[PDB]
Amino acid sequence: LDQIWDDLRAGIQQVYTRQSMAKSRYMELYTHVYNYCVGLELYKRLKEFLKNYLTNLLKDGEDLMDESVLKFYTQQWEDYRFSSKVLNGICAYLNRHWVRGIYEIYSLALVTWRDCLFRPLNKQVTNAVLKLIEKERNGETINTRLISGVVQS
Amino acid sequence: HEVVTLWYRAPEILLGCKYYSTAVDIWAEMVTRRALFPGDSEIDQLFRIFRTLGVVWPGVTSMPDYKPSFPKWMLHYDPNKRISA
Amino acid sequence: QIYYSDKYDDEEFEYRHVMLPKDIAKLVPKTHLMSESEWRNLGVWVHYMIHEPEPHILLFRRPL
Amino acid sequence: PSIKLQSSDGEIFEVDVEIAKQSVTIKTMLEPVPLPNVNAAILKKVIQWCTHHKDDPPTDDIPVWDQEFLKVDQGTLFELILAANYLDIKGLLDVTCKTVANMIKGKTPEEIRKTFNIFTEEEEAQVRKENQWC
Amino acid sequence: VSWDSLPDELLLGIFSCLCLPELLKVSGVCKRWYRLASDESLWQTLDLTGKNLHPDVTGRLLSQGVIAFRCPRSFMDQPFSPFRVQHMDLSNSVIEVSTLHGILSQCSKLQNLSLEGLRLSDPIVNTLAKLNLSGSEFALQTLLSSCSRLDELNLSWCFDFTEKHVQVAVAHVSETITQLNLSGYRKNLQKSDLSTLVRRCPNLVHLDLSDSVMLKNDCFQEFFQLNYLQHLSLSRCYDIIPETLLELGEIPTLKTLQVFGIVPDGTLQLLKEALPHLQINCSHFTTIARPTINQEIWGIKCRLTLQ
């Protein structure tokens, strides 16, 4: 039933935010995974939702250029990766099993992040990373996970 | 199915059809009383008949010894159309 | 051993039946037919095929 | 270690890591949850098969035990295959698929359709015409 | 107990363990089952030897997602989208020349087909050249360079090869050829061609080069240049040094004893003294570019084998 997704989208949405959760949610969404099958028009909706959420997240990334955009970008990327991992682990059956962006949820998230990173924020992130590297090489040392996150990304 | 005779072998046996009904009776083993009769090997015996006497046999391509690459050149060829003695 | 037969056919082709000893029949494989230079042990063109019910038959080919 | 699971009707069953290693959908769990799809009858049936079939190298080319093991009514086989598809099992899924394939070997269309409980007189003549090659 | 509520790919699991009688039997029950009969996954390897069907049926089969085909000695005489056929060899079944449009004209890509003893016209090779040909020269020359990746080329007993046709043997541009077998043109091959052919190919693991009669003095050691082409393959020779054939193979590495053929009595048994290090030849049989080798060749086992 298509009417279940509009009510169940909150379960996936709250995954992006880090807090407590109910153990039954995993089984609740896992049942709806195969209960959806109609049963094919789901990839486009998921792609649109991911794209709009990613654009909304990137929109609040302009007022920070250095020493603040790095922490924010790293933590948002960690949250996005965690949400993508949860989505892959909770629904990985009705994606490409029947015959055949890449259909895989992890690959879809990766390609969306790749083709969204082409925005001018890449230049400012690179400039921040370079200036942090020069500041570290000047003699002082600071935390390393901030740019390590984007490196692993 | 197995036939020890050579010059009077059952036509069904040479064609690969083990099961036949009253085929031997319909098919004079030696009437010529000479060496002109086609006494040959297992395949050469049928080759001699094919050379001598060239739709005609419905359902011919359904036997173990009925190949499709063969050349073109009370005795009855059809086993079903055989008159009893 | 070598066997001989009349080289007569209704069409323009020509064929002759040949036979080989049982000892040499082991080398001949039922899967793949022999070639021009393969059949040299007998000491006697290419091996075309064999007989359907019989296990030993050779015809050979003659090119124009 | 001992791991417990919650049945649909409300029963509690004991499972072991070795007994559940061959599974992949519950291996991630072991690495009580609501499972409405499965019931107590299939839970004991699956767990007893796993205990008797756990160690193996990594007639009808299948174990003789499976012949009398799967001799059940059509309804239970429907539940078993549905659970196997949901549990993404391999050993049980392959065995029941082979058993079904053998049972549909050389059977009249009338009995197959009635047993399955599921395109005639307009296309039967056509399909017959282009299938005599076999 | 309805069995029609299952997904299609659970049904594919059932259909993956069926043979042709039951597979074509089960087709005529429902439209769904009718479609799941024809999936590309089920039809991978299909092998029908000598079932004398017309090529319309096998065209219907090339329209149903099959990847491999091996069918010798069938009868297809009476007369589409390009198709994915990587593994298809041929032994010479009798086939009409005109009805190759429905078989080969569609597909020229992929590993290609392997003929033997088949008489055919130029346009078929023209579409093919976009690979055994046992039994015009421009089409063959184009096809030789058409598949640069492929290294094995076989041809023998050509019925339309002239003296000038053998000149193109050295013109073949291929620096990655590993195995080859050309012979039978004893009265047409030029002895000077092999001298340049050896230089053209950097190496040749297998090279029969039999049916030599003149046995020119230069050819005795001209071919032996590198250590990757050592062999002693020679047959049907009239003028040759007896019991002293080890001169050509001064530095042999592999075991090759293809010396049988038309030789005078008393020399075949004495030839063992000229190669005491090597063993005596046991059996002689060509095993190069074989369409099939008793059917598991190239890892293609036909689950849809008629027998």
Swiss-Prot record, chain A:
Q: Which domain of life is it from?
A: Eukaryota
Q: In which tissues is it expressed?
A: Expressed in lung fibroblasts.
Cite the post-translational modification comment. Neddylated; which enhances the ubiquitination activity of SCF. Neddylation prevents binding of the inhibitor CAND1. Neddylation leads to structural rearrangment in the complex that allows interaction between the E2 ubiquitin-conjugating enzyme and the acceptor ubiquitin. Deneddylated via its interaction with the COP9 signalosome (CSN) complex. (Microbial infection) Deneddylated by Epstein-Barr virus BPLF1 leading to a S-phase-like environment that is required for efficient replication of the viral genome.
Spell out the family assignment given in the record's similarity comment: Belongs to the cullin family.
The subunit structure is: Component of multiple Cul1-RING E3 ubiquitin-protein ligase complexes commonly known as SCF (SKP1-CUL1-F-box) complexes, consisting of CUL1, SKP1, RBX1 and a variable F-box domain-containing protein as substrate-specific subunit. Component of the SCF(FBXW11) complex containing FBXW11. Component of the SCF(SKP2) complex containing SKP2, in which it interacts directly with SKP1, SKP2 and RBX1. Component of the SCF(FBXW2) complex containing FBXW2. Component of the SCF(FBXO32) complex containing FBXO32. Component of the probable SCF(FBXO7) complex containing FBXO7.
Q: What is this protein called?
A: Cullin-1
Write the span of the intact protein that is present: 17 to 207 of 776
From Swiss-Prot, chain B:
Where does the entry annotate site (CDK7 binding)? 6
Q: What induces it?
A: Induced transiently by TGFB1 at an early phase of TGFB1-mediated apoptosis.
- Its domain of life? Eukaryota
Q: How is it modified after translation?
A: Nitrosylated after treatment with nitric oxide (DETA-NO).
Protein family? Belongs to the protein kinase superfamily. CMGC Ser/Thr protein kinase family. CDC2/CDKX subfamily.
Q: What does this protein do?
A: Serine/threonine-protein kinase involved in the control of the cell cycle; essential for meiosis, but dispensable for mitosis. Phosphorylates CABLES1, CTNNB1, CDK2AP2, ERCC6, NBN, USP37, p53/TP53, NPM1, CDK7, RB1, BRCA2, MYC, NPAT, EZH2. Triggers duplication of centrosomes and DNA.
Subunit and interaction comment: Found in a complex with CABLES1, CCNA1 and CCNE1. Interacts with CABLES1. Interacts with UHRF2. Part of a complex consisting of UHRF2, CDK2 and CCNE1. Interacts with the Speedy/Ringo proteins SPDYA and SPDYC. Interaction with SPDYA promotes kinase activation via a conformation change that alleviates obstruction of the substrate-binding cleft by the T-loop. Found in a complex with both SPDYA and CDKN1B/KIP1. Binds to RB1 and CDK7.
Q: What is this protein called?
A: Cyclin-dependent kinase 2
Q: Which gene encodes it?
A: CDK2
Curated annotation (Swiss-Prot), chain C:
Which PROSITE patterns does this UniProt record tie to the protein? Answer: CKS_1, CKS_2
The family line of this record is: Belongs to the CKS family.
Name of the gene: CKS1B
Q: Name one Pfam family in it.
A: CKS
Taxonomy of origin reads: Eukaryota, Metazoa, Chordata, Craniata, Vertebrata
SUPFAM superfamilies registered for this protein in UniProt: Cell cycle regulatory proteins
* One Gene Ontology cellular component annotation held by this UniProt entry: cyclin-dependent protein kinase holoenzyme complex
Q: Which InterPro entries match?
A: Cyclin-dep_kinase_reg-sub (IPR000789), Cyclin-dep_kinase_reg-sub_sf (IPR036858)
* Name the record gives this protein: Cyclin-dependent kinases regulatory subunit 1
Q: How does it assemble?
A: Forms a homohexamer that can probably bind six kinase subunits.
UniProtKB/Swiss-Prot annotation, chain E:
GO BP terms, alphabetized: cellular response to cell-matrix adhesion; defense response to virus; G1/S transition of mitotic cell cycle; G2/M transition of mitotic cell cycle; innate immune response; positive regulation of double-strand break repair via homologous recombination; positive regulation of intracellular estrogen receptor signaling pathway; positive regulation of protein polyubiquitination
Pathway where it operates: Protein modification; protein ubiquitination
Query: Listed GO cellular component terms?
Result: cytosol; nucleolus; nucleoplasm; nucleus; SCF ubiquitin ligase complex
**Residues carrying Phosphoserine:** 81
Location within or outside the cell: Cytoplasm; Nucleus
Post-translational modification summary for this protein = Phosphorylated on serine and threonine resudues in response to DNA damage, promoting 'Lys-63'-linked ubiquitination of NBN.
Task: List keywords of the entry alphabetically.
Answer: Acetylation, Antiviral defense, Cytoplasm, Host-virus interaction, Immunity, Innate immunity, Leucine-rich repeat, Nucleus, Phosphoprotein, Repeat, Ubl conjugation, Ubl conjugation pathway
* Region annotation Mediates interaction with IFI27: where it falls in the sequence: 294-307
Q: Where are the LRR repeats?
A: 57-79, 80-106, 112-130, 131-149, 150-176, 178-200, 201-222, 226-248, 251-270, 272-293
Q: Name the chain's protein.
A: S-phase kinase-associated protein 2
Q: Which organism is it from?
A: Homo sapiens
* Gene of this entry: SKP2
